[PDB]
Amino acid sequence: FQPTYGVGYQPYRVVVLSFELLHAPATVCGPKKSTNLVKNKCVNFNFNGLTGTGVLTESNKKFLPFQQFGRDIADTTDAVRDPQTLEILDITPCSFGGVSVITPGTNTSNQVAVLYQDVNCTEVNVFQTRAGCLIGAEHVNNSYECDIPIGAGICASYQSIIA
């Protein structure tokens, strides 16, 4: 080898990578991509192969350092540890509630009110009951006989629709 050589006689360093895959567990992988953690939103989470959909909030549950996920009685993952920063997050299902329609007779009126059962009013004439969030009914301080039952001591009537 001289430096005055032409191309084709110059030295060439060659590395041959042979990826072989025996049925032992695989330990050579690429870089696992990660994205910024977004909290308090219904997102699809994928934590170390455990996937799902939920709202990831801060947790007061103190995990032991070898443990990663958390399960309730019904064996559903409700707690998890973030692998980047060792913090505990309580997965909560993206909120679901019954949508009930409170109406008088259509001979009487076409006005309706909507009850979102077990749903807070901040994430859906808006009134918060223990039965749920009631939209379209004017809450009054007067007490009457129950006409249309809502629940938890709340009843609706037509006079507009009042609750």
Q: Which of residues 81-140 bind another protein (CB under 8 A)?
A: 82-84, 94-108, 112, 115-116, 119, 123-124
- Residue closer to another protein by CB (options 9, 96) is 96
Query: Which contacts of 105-113 are long-range, i.e. CB under 8 A and separated by 24 or more positions?
Result: 108/158, 109/158, 111/136, 111/158, 111/160, 111/161, 112/136, 112/161, 113/137, 113/156, 113/161, 113/163
User: To the nearest whole angstrom, how small is the minimum distance from the Cβ of residue 4 to another protein?
Assistant: 19
**3-state SS assignment for residue 23:** coil
CB of 93 to another protein, least distance (A): 9
User: Does 148 contact another protein by CB under 8 A?
Assistant: yes
DSSP state of 27: -
The pattern of x and - marking residues 16 through 55 that bind another protein according to CB under 8 A reads: xxxxxxxxxxxxxxxxxxxxxxx--xxxxxxxx--xxx--
